[PDB]
Amino acid sequence: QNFLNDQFVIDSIVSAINPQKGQAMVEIGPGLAALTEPVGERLDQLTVIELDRDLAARLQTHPFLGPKLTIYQQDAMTFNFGELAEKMGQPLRVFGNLPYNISTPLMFHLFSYTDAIADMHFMLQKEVVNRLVAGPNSKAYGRLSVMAQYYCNVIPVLEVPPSAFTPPPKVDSAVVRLVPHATMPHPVKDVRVLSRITTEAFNQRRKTIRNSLGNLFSVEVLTGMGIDPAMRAENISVAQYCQMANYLAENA
Amino acid sequence: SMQDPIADMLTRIRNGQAANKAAVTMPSSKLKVAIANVLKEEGFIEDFKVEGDTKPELELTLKYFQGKAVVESIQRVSRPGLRIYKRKDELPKVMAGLGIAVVSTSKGVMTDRAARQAGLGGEIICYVA
Amino acid sequence: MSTLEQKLTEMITAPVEALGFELVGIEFIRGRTSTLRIYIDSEDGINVDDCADVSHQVSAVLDVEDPITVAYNLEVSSPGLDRPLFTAEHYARFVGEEVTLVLRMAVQNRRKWQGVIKAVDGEMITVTVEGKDEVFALSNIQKANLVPHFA
Amino acid sequence: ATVNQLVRKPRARKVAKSNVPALEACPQKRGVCTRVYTTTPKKPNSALRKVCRVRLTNGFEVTSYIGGEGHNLQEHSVILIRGGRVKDLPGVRYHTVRGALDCSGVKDRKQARSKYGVKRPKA
RNA sequence: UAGCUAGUAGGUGGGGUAACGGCUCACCUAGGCGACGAUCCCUAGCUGGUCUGAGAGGAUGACCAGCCACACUGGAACUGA
RNA sequence: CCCGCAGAAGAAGCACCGGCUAACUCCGUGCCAGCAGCCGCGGUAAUACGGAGGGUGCAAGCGUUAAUCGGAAUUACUGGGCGUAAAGCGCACGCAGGCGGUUUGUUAAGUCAGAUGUGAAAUCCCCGGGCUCAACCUGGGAACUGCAUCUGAUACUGGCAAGCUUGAGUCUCGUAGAGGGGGGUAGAAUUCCAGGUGUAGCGGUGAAAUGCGUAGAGAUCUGGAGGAAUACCGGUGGCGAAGGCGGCCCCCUGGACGAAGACUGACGCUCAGGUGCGAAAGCGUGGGGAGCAAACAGGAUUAGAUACCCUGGUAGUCCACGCCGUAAACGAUGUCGACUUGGAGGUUGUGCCCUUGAGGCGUGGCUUCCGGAGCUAACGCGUUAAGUCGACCGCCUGGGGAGUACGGCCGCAAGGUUAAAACUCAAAUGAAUUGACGGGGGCGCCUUGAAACCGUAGGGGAACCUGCGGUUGGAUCACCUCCU
Ligand SMILES: [Mg+2]
Ligand SMILES: [Mg+2]
Ligand SMILES: [Mg+2]
Ligand SMILES: [Mg+2]
Ligand SMILES: [Mg+2]
Ligand SMILES: [Mg+2]
Ligand SMILES: [Mg+2]
Ligand SMILES: [Mg+2]
Ligand SMILES: [Mg+2]
Ligand SMILES: [Mg+2]
Ligand SMILES: [Mg+2]
Ligand SMILES: [Mg+2]
């Protein structure tokens, strides 16, 4: 597990977040006081979840912070952010740092709240961030990056050396921000069709899509959509993936 | 495959000398006989002989002086990969003249000591001491 | 990039103003070393010697109460013949003058720029970018430099 | 390996750069101090180093070391530079010349003074 | 930097030069060149020499002597040995 | 140029002084900062900073920078390397190219000898001369390694001609073998189906859970299905170029080794380009799918767990036909040929002796482990060299950046392939020695219960996790001074 150590990049992250009132801000994983303090400072009042009840006591008893935040002590994947968006008057800014096994769940739970979230701002490991922003025709591309880029516009904020962290890992990591689309540029009939199309395709990414999505559609459907079935799964943009999803859903 | 019948006899001389053998033997050839003769003529061996019609064999009787081999160095400069020729004056000195080089001249094979005073350059076979 | 930028500014201000010099810029870089770069000017002049003085002072007066010291070293500098600049008042001294800018906003109609300062707003730099004109917030920029014409 | 290989391809003796290339083999070069600054080398290292960004007549701009005591030297001022490596510093391969065209001699110094650009005391 | 080339390669005949010659022009043949590096691109005037080196080598061609090319830039041509 | 006149009178500096490197001590200084080519110098003395005295060197100069050669053999013609330091193509065949046994004649291209013409002068070098000397100038010689031509010489090489049998290779007879290709077939085994008997459990783990069973599971009997693999022999064992090859029989088919002759007559070796073979993974097209199993899914575990555990499970794994073209494809060891102490085995021919049957003398081939000489940085290698050598090919030239960019080529795609540089560092590295080891382990003493990678494909909080198959290179880390 990790949390940051050096004021230069702490200050860079909290300043790049631009946390002020007129925003429905909520931290998750406040962790070490050093990086939760500047955001709880700049916001006149701030909401937070900590997963740990002991750290939640450490910070809630801290007079810089307990008087200056409202604090919650539970697994955030239980947490009803759609009601917190109502209680905070406008859709949320959700942000912070974590041990990040939970990362994959965080994204899906955030996406379960794409209406209730205004934006997300989080640190993550280099490979998963570069995947999350990957262009369709790259080895870094794939199913989770597809779903992420489907739900939101995604934007690297800044990148951080491993010696910057309190227990310094071996692994460089970056803060990234993302934005649930105000209207989906890719309208879809359902997301489960996307999720299964993408998993089938990426479970078979070395073979032709005739030997991946063509295990379900015909070649004449695919070419009828304007898609060459002789491509590989990692040639395919989210645009034609959502077109396939709509085709599956509407022809079923 | 075999591509230097002369380096073969010289390496047989070396290896036989190092193995303390009283004599060593080779498939004979006219040039080897002439070589064996000039190095007997400079005393580097006890004797040489040839035995048998049709296939021939040339035997070299290796010389040991008190406790040791007489030849201590023998090496061939005209690689079949690149031949070597020298003018009458350019005939080199082996061990500053203590040793011998073997020269095939257009008047036959001989020592460099013979060849320089004979005024003939030629092809150079090898050095010995 | 800096730690506690206001605290740092005041701790630096004490020897700067004791020397009667003026601050201009504070910036830190993180890399093979991690290091702090101070721009000071005084319009009578800054010599190498004036940098030497204030640097030996901050090398004591900051260090003894450092909020952080990771890989640390620092330098103090005159702001160059192409000068880094940081505030509304700076750009306001230099209205009509050619500039380059790089931004915390990072979007097409590219937020990396060459410009001539058109006018200053309380929140923004207005600038003749690309021979067009446009305006960028003091908060949506992050670094800028002036008279890049001088190599 | 074989002589036949050596005639098929001769010995490739390597080239090497000038390690001080912005001179173009001029014994010295002139420039202007595009900025000037002073640095501590390290967290415990107290020995301040005095350094300049300087643009040469040839349009190169490079770091150069300021040896010895202070000067007038300030950004519109002009400098003669020559080869010389500050071993402890990264890539600093150019020394400024004491007693050059905009550069004072070390007035105090009584030793090695032809390095430091300063004339015999007037006794 | 792998292929290159149509007066290109060769021939006959006409024209042309002080002189041989696609030098050039008509026809005629389909050649000619190149991985023993042509073609293409970069860089350079050349040499006796010079410096270094134990030597082999390496570097280099300022001065002096020989050869070459150029004369505001790009085109021609007059005259004359 | 000589001569007269007066007077030491008019005329010395610049580096450096810890070591390399000739030359040292006082003083301050505080790591203030200076010092610097490098190694490095310093707080309380510093022979290294600054100052002083003292010293050393060079001198009308002395230092600094730049630049070329040197040193540097550090591109290794002379004069280097490639098991592990960088380096032997994954393997093979083969064109061009290089190289080539042996005898005789012939030729005379190379080669050798001699001559002749030429090789500008100057410069260089030698021997002289001349400026008072020197620099400088200059006489004469030598030198100008060469080129051309003529003349001989004939060993060697090359050409030509003729042969030769030792290299190469054909034949006859045997021999051993998971060599390959094609086609049948068997006994185990798992799963599955169909019953039959039967009944509350089964299953799984550390324990659980998910899972399965009262629609009868599980178990056990019978009968059937289907796909895959060959228990044991089996080995420090054979075959194969390498990759690799293992139930059995047939069919086609490659190579090898021994035997004893016979035959051809140097037909040879190596090999840039070229061509082809080439594990595992993955791809292409169409089948198959038992068992296993990336991905995935679900249950657990853990601070978290993405792992490790379990219940599932797709691709894949199989087949035919295309492709890819890489592997620690490694003996990390290019191919071919000759030579050079021994010793104990293994395996497979063969000869002679067998008193037979065992034996015992030999004698090929292949192969394993020791080890002499020699070699090697050392480790080690060692007649199957890493010894001694001959011919040719491939490859390396500090560490990173980087087998990465870019371009070309190639590939269906993955990617492959060829392949930089800027930039950056004073190392990077191999072997081996001594302490730690340490966790010990045995009995204060001797001394160890203490995975890395390769290729490739996919997941992806990590470094990482997973699948396939290959390799073994199966781990540590390192502080207070010195002269004869
Ligand atoms: Mg004509
Ligand atoms: Mg030398
Ligand atoms: Mg000394
Ligand atoms: Mg070497
Ligand atoms: Mg190596
Ligand atoms: Mg090999
Ligand atoms: Mg011959
Ligand atoms: Mg002959
Ligand atoms: Mg397939
Ligand atoms: Mg396979
Ligand atoms: Mg590549
Ligand atoms: Mg293998």
Side-chain angles (χ1 to χ4, degrees):
Chain A
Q1 72 196 136
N2 320 91
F3 290 113
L4 202 60
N5 86 43
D6 42 358
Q7 289 137 29
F8 306 100
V9 284
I10 293 164
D11 294 343
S12 83
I13 291 157
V14 305
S15 61
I17 288 162
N18 293 281
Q20 300 89 226
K21 294 276 69 171
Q23 307 164 10
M25 297 227 67
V26 42
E27 265 206 296
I28 303 91
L32 303 178
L35 91 182
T36 179
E37 279 185 356
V39 301
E41 165 259 295
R42 198 192 287 202
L43 289 157
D44 307 56
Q45 284 285 334
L46 158 69
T47 298
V48 62
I49 297 158
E50 190 47 279
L51 316 182
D52 180 26
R53 289 55 163 198
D54 304 345
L55 280 170
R58 297 295 72 70
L59 65 96
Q60 188 279 343
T61 58
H62 184 42
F64 188 109
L65 196 164
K68 210 173 188 308
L69 280 83
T70 179
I71 295 141
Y72 297 93
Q73 312 88 348
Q74 67 195 89
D75 172 15
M77 307 297 84
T78 67
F79 188 95
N80 60 345
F81 295 96
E83 184 57 24
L84 181 63
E86 194 80 336
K87 291 187 296 188
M88 298 283 282
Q90 61 277 343
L92 307 176
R93 303 194 63 204
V94 280
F95 68 108
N97 197 349
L98 289 99
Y100 289 134
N101 168 268
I102 197 173
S103 57
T104 298
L106 300 184
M107 278 76 82
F108 288 111
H109 199 70
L110 292 161
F111 303 155
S112 85
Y113 286 123
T114 47
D115 51 347
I117 300 311
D119 49 81
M120 317 79 147
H121 289 65
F122 287 94
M123 176 53 67
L124 277 186
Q125 174 263 37
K126 63 187 188 175
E127 161 258 322
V128 301
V129 298
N130 77 46
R131 172 149 184 248
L132 280 162
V133 301
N137 202 96
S138 65
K139 183 55 63 84
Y141 186 68
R143 164 255 175 169
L144 291 180
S145 73
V146 171
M147 301 307 294
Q149 293 173 25
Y150 178 81
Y151 284 117
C152 300
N153 195 5
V154 188
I155 307 95
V157 177
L158 59 87
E159 306 69 36
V160 182
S163 61
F165 302 87
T166 288
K170 306 192 196 177
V171 202
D172 181 299
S173 299
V175 51
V176 183
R177 70 184 293 275
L178 56 145
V179 178
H181 306 284
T183 186
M184 306 306 284
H186 302 106
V188 86
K189 287 185 161 77
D190 161 56
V191 293
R192 292 152 291 186
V193 288
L194 274 168
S195 77
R196 70 183 291 187
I197 286 165
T198 54
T199 53
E200 195 281 344
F202 282 99
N203 287 346
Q204 295 199 345
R205 70 193 292 164
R206 316 336 313 301
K207 44 183 59 179
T208 55
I209 65 172
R210 197 268 281 178
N211 306 354
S212 322
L213 182 55
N215 313 331
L216 170 63
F217 292 0
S218 69
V219 293
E220 58 74 23
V221 163
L222 292 166
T223 55
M225 309 320 291
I227 277 61
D228 174 16
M231 292 187 288
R232 336 304 278 212
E234 66 189 33
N235 304 143
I236 307 307
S237 182
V238 311
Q240 59 267 47
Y241 278 127
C242 79
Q243 185 198 17
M244 300 314 106
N246 291 337
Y247 189 89
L248 198 176
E250 74 210 3
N251 293 270
Chain B
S1 55
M2 168 49 62
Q3 298 187 25
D4 188 352
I6 304 308
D8 198 75
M9 72 165 283
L10 301 182
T11 54
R12 281 173 191 238
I13 289 288
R14 166 161 51 263
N15 294 358
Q17 273 289 5
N20 304 97
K21 294 307 220 300
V24 75
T25 194
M26 280 76 62
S28 195
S29 182
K30 59 197 287 267
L31 177 57
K32 300 181 189 181
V33 177
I35 287 164
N37 183 55
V38 296
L39 64 91
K40 194 178 69 73
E41 184 260 316
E42 276 290 351
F44 296 111
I45 66 172
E46 306 288 16
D47 193 24
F48 77 88
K49 289 293 166 293
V50 288
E51 310 84 4
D53 69 324
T54 76
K55 289 196 208 191
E57 273 285 314
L58 164 59
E59 172 269 295
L60 276 284
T61 304
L62 272 55
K63 187 176 284 181
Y64 297 82
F65 187 49
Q66 66 200 356
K68 66 187 63 71
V70 163
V71 59
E72 293 176 287
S73 62
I74 193 161
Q75 61 184 323
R76 152 161 162 99
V77 73
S78 41
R79 277 191 71 241
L82 73 102
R83 305 305 181 140
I84 293 292
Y85 312 91
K86 298 292 179 180
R87 296 182 184 174
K88 64 188 296 207
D89 46 356
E90 301 312 316
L91 304 188
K93 298 288 287 289
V94 179
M95 306 267 284
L98 271 59
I100 292 293
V102 177
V103 188
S104 47
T105 76
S106 320
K107 295 291 189 168
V109 286
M110 66 194 74
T111 65
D112 64 297
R113 187 164 67 116
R116 71 174 58 80
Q117 72 76 56
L120 297 181
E123 166 166 28
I124 313 301
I125 308 190
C126 58
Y127 307 145
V128 62
Chain C
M1 174 195 287
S2 176
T3 171
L4 300 163
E5 313 96 323
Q6 315 72 24
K7 179 180 292 191
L8 269 291
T9 297
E10 302 327 306
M11 295 189 304
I12 296 162
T13 296
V16 160
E17 298 299 338
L19 296 164
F21 306 155
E22 313 91 274
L23 265 172
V24 181
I26 299 295
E27 289 302 342
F28 188 91
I29 178 62
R30 189 83 176 71
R32 301 312 308 145
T33 68
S34 305
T35 178
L36 184 67
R37 302 161 294 176
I38 295 93
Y39 296 97
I40 280 160
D41 210 354
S42 304
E43 310 318 302
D44 50 348
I46 291 299
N47 296 345
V48 64
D49 189 31
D50 300 315
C51 290
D53 274 339
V54 69
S55 57
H56 69 65
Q57 274 147 105
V58 290
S59 79
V61 71
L62 307 185
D63 180 18
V64 297
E65 63 170 312
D66 261 356
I68 188 161
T69 320
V70 297
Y72 145 71
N73 83 26
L74 66 73
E75 75 193 39
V76 316
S77 188
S78 56
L81 294 186
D82 167 357
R83 64 198 318 292
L85 82 174
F86 304 89
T87 76
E89 182 270 313
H90 308 167
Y91 313 103
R93 299 206 301 274
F94 307 126
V95 176
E97 308 183 34
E98 70 288 348
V99 283
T100 185
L101 311 91
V102 67
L103 292 95
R104 183 59 278 176
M105 51 166 32
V107 59
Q108 194 44 252
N109 172 71
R110 71 158 208 188
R111 307 307 197 284
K112 163 61 184 182
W113 289 136
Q114 200 295 324
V116 181
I117 297 161
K118 174 60 175 181
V120 175
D121 307 336
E123 306 73 29
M124 331 286 283
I125 313 86
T126 87
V127 51
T128 312
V129 283
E130 313 191 322
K132 204 190 71 176
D133 294 87
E134 193 161 351
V135 51
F136 308 100
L138 296 156
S139 59
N140 83 21
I141 72 150
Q142 55 88 345
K143 168 62 148 60
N145 254 82
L146 164 73
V147 302
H149 174 283
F150 299 108
Chain D
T2 78
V3 75
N4 207 64
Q5 288 163 324
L6 294 181
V7 66
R8 288 164 58 224
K9 176 54 59 175
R11 289 303 194 173
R13 54 134 291 273
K14 69 182 73 79
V15 70
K17 62 165 61 178
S18 178
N19 61 13
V20 63
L23 294 180
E24 302 87 61
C26 297
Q28 302 85 8
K29 286 299 299 166
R30 170 177 51 121
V32 68
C33 50
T34 66
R35 55 174 284 246
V36 63
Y37 62 97
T38 59
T39 191
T40 59
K42 201 197 165 181
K43 165 177 71 177
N45 189 322
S46 67
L48 282 179
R49 301 298 169 64
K50 304 183 200 81
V51 191
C52 173
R53 296 320 304 218
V54 46
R55 191 186 71 248
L56 287 305
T57 76
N58 62 19
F60 282 66
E61 185 292 309
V62 77
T63 182
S64 183
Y65 176 61
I66 315 304
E69 302 194 353
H71 308 231
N72 80 84
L73 290 175
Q74 173 165 179
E75 300 190 338
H76 300 82
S77 63
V78 294
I79 311 96
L80 192 76
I81 83 178
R82 60 74 165 190
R85 177 176 53 258
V86 182
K87 175 55 165 60
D88 37 37
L89 290 176
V92 184
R93 292 158 295 147
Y94 308 82
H95 297 339
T96 60
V97 175
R98 294 308 297 228
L101 81 174
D102 212 359
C103 166
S104 53
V106 178
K107 67 191 177 175
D108 294 338
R109 193 178 180 107
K110 282 184 285 285
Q111 188 175 114
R113 66 184 182 277
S114 70
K115 282 186 165 74
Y116 292 93
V118 72
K119 292 176 175 62
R120 171 175 271 207
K122 311 303 179 178

